[PDB]
């Protein structure tokens, strides 16, 4: 009977919640009460990257921490030299509606995806001096909200059909399909060892997927609104979920539950973009009120504020060496805040 | 200048990319984007054939003006998470079937699509170009049964002049922003041929009024 299957799911939901309450002896806010705070963190705009002509929807640094690709809705995908502010590449796309972009960890490939239900991978380092479409990965039945390169052969895309998928690039095909969400998967993020990844959907829940196995390991039902963005703690044993109810929340995978809440009463608009700094002490959130807050991650209190954007900061990313922070907003400007 | 021989030529590649970014951005700034948002499958496929993967852009050109019509109804996701990409669109081409009032109700479902899109926080200034399709099929549905099936609070008689003027006023009622935006109503069907000419007349009133906010005249 169907009415017994809702029941034994709830009695299994109880023992998850009972074992969640069994392990909460003290919160992370209780341990970091006597710890030196990081003070005011004031970061000046070093570079301001011009040249875009529409709303910037995503960026992604390279592993070399000097190149960043940046998609925008004018149908362009510019690759920047972040030190001396040159455009290395300007890749004209097949459609303007691009909602995410990626950068392969080797540097040879760049994938952008958007409202076309498609993920198109570009080839940077090649003969003929072109940036041509290496592959176009079709099979999603919704807008492709985030794509992240595992390596040069595999890419994990998150679409709005309540499904993440793992692609093979050398033959465009869904290797494993990561089902289990009940809402549009708004943003994913990969673990540093890339055996696991998290994906925060529009059902107030992020998950923890085993990449090689295909299943969902844990379900982190802590929020109350749409999880617009997500990022990993650099240890890989914790993550942070920027929501639409203006609360970043730091979970962790070993304790299976929520640790903190980065809530302030002066903010009411949600978070478009979360990225930890290197060493994971700061938690740079990206809000809709033209702002970026640099939250401490051991204490909850706000350390600094990155103000200077004229529209919604839609994307931010700290470099792999932790030197800079590039927040690309809805006005056609990226800003690099060392 | 303290730049090397390669760093001098990496800046010149950037400044040649900047030339191709402005010359392709000014080409796309002279184009009119029109988010076509016909509710359901009623009347939406008629006016794309009259004027000439999830999102189906239908490019066409009338009187040296290039229109882009982003038929986006084949997405079937949550609408609030990607409708802000269409912020800054010139207009919105809504499509209502006039004859679906007998076919909750289908006409009332297309009012909830209109009410949720005309008071959206992104489209507070994009003028809806409302197309009431199926007019030559709306006349015989009226003469077989009055409007009183769909609309309970109907005071006028059954005939087509009072019914079609009522459904025009029911959709021009759902906007609360009477000062920032306008609703250009047409009464079309499959046999009409002016429906490419009406869009050019309706977007040229939009871009004129959008230009008169820029110079401070309005």
């Amino acid at each position, epitope marked *: 009977e169907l009415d017994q299957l809702r029941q034994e799911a709830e009695q299994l939901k109880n023992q998850i919640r009972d074992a969640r309450k069994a392990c909460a002896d003290a919160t992370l806010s209780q341990i970091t009460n006597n710890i030196d705070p990081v003070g005011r963190i004031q970061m000046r705009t070093r570079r301001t990257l011009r040249g875009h002509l529409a709303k910037i929807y995503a960026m992604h640094w390279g592993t070399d921490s*000097r*190149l960043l690709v940046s998609a925008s809705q004018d149908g362009k995908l510019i690759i920047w*030299d972040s030190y001396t502010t*040159n455009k*290395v*590449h300007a890749i004209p796309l097949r459609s303007s509606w691009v909602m995410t972009c990626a950068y392969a960890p080797s*540097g040879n490939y760049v994938a952008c995806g958007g409202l076309d239900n498609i993920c198109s991978i570009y080839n940077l*380092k090649t*003969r*003929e*001096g*072109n940036v041509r479409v290496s592959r176009e990965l079709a099979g999603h039945t919704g807008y492709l909200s985030c794509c992240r390169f595992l390596d040069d052969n595999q890419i994990v895309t998150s679409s709005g059909d309540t499904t993440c998928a793992l692609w093979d690039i050398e033959t465009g095909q869904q290797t494993t399909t990561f089902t289990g969400h009940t809402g549009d998967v708004m943003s994913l993020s990969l673990a540093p060892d890339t055996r696991l990844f998290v994906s925060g959907a529009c059902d107030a829940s992020a998950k923890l997927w085993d990449v090689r196995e295909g299943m969902c390991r844990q379900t982190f039902t802590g929020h109350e609104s749409d999880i617009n963005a997500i990022c990993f703690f650099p240890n890989g044993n914790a993550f942070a979920t920027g929501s639409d109810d203006a609360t970043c929340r730091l979970f962790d995978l070993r304790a299976d539950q929520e640790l903190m809440t980065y809530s302030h009463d002066n903010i009411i608009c949600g978070i478009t973009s979360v990225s930890f700094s290197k060493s994971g002490r700061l938690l740079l959130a990206g809000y809709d009120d033209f702002n970026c807050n640099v939250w401490d991650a051991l204490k909850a209190d706000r350390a600094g504020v990155l103000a200077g954007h004229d529209n919604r900061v839609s994307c931010l990313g700290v470099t792999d060496d932790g030197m800079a922070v590039a927040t690309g907003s809805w006005d056609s400007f990226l800003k690099i805040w060392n | 200048c*303290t730049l*090397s*021989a*390669e*760093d*001098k*030529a*990496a800046v*010149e*590649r950037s400044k*040649m990319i900047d030339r191709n970014l402005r010359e392709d951005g000014e080409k796309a700034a002279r184009e009119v984007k029109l988010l076509l948002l016909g509710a359901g499958e009623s009347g939406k496929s008629t006016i794309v054939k009259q004027m000439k993967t999830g999102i189906v852009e239908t490019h066409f050109t009338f009187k040296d003006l290039h229109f882009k019509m982003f038929d986006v109804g084949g997405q079937r996701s949550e609408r609030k998470k990607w409708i802000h990409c269409f912020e800054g669109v010139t207009a919105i081409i809504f499509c209502v079937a006039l004859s679906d009032y007998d076919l909750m109700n289908r006409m009332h479902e297309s009012m909830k699509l209109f009410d949720s899109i005309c008071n959206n926080k992104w489209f507070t200034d994009t003028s809806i170009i409302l197309f009431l399709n199926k007019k030559d099929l709306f006349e015989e549905k009226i003469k077989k049964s009055p409007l009183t099936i769909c609309y309970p609070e109907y005071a006028g008689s059954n005939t087509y002049e009072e019914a079609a003027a009522y459904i025009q006023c029911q959709f021009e009622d759902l906007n609360k922003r009477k000062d920032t935006k306008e609703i250009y109503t047409h009464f079309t069907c499959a046999t009409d041929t002016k429906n490419v000419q009406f869009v050019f007349d309706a977007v040229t009133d939009v871009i004129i009024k959008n230009n008169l906010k820029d110079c401070g005249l309005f």
Partner: single-chain antibody
Amino acid sequence: VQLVESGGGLVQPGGSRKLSCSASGFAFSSFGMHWVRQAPEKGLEWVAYISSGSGTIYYADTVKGRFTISRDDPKNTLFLQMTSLRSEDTAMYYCVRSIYYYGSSPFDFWGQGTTLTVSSSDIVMTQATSSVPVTPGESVSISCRSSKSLLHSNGNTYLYWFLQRPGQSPQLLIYRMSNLASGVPDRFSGSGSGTAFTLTISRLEAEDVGVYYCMQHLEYPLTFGAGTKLEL
């Protein structure tokens, strides 16, 4: 990708000739193309350069005001109009693409070359070994020495290592030093001291029998080193 040129032959001394390099197989309008000549018994010397979109144009000291470089981006061809050809212009003119961005490999593909034959402050590189006696399989080392420190302020050291197999055009091996051209084996590696440089070949083979040229790229004119010929 290929670059085939045309022109040359017996020219009267003091005449004129147009050298035409027709580029087929790559995006020609984004490559800042060079012209590099080679005397009949000497090493390379750089002749002319035109950018992408014909922005900047440089020449050597010998051909400034005497030659003229020009490119045709729609027709995908590159020209070199030379007037008053002296008897020191008898050479074989290569046609070298070179794109410049961050992490690019300039000078990567070279044209085949057309034997022209007329009738009858620069960073002075010095490859001291004119010829190295070579047994196959051993580890050989080609040493190049600059006359100005090529290490720029931005960390890059603009020295390029070319190999010209006997009967072929110079192939790029190593761009800005200890890099590697995409397509050459792992056995090549270049470890330099900012002003004195070294090429290391580990497991030598008969495909590496040739002449090795070290080329600066710090400033124009691009002075090539002399020949380091490796013989079995």
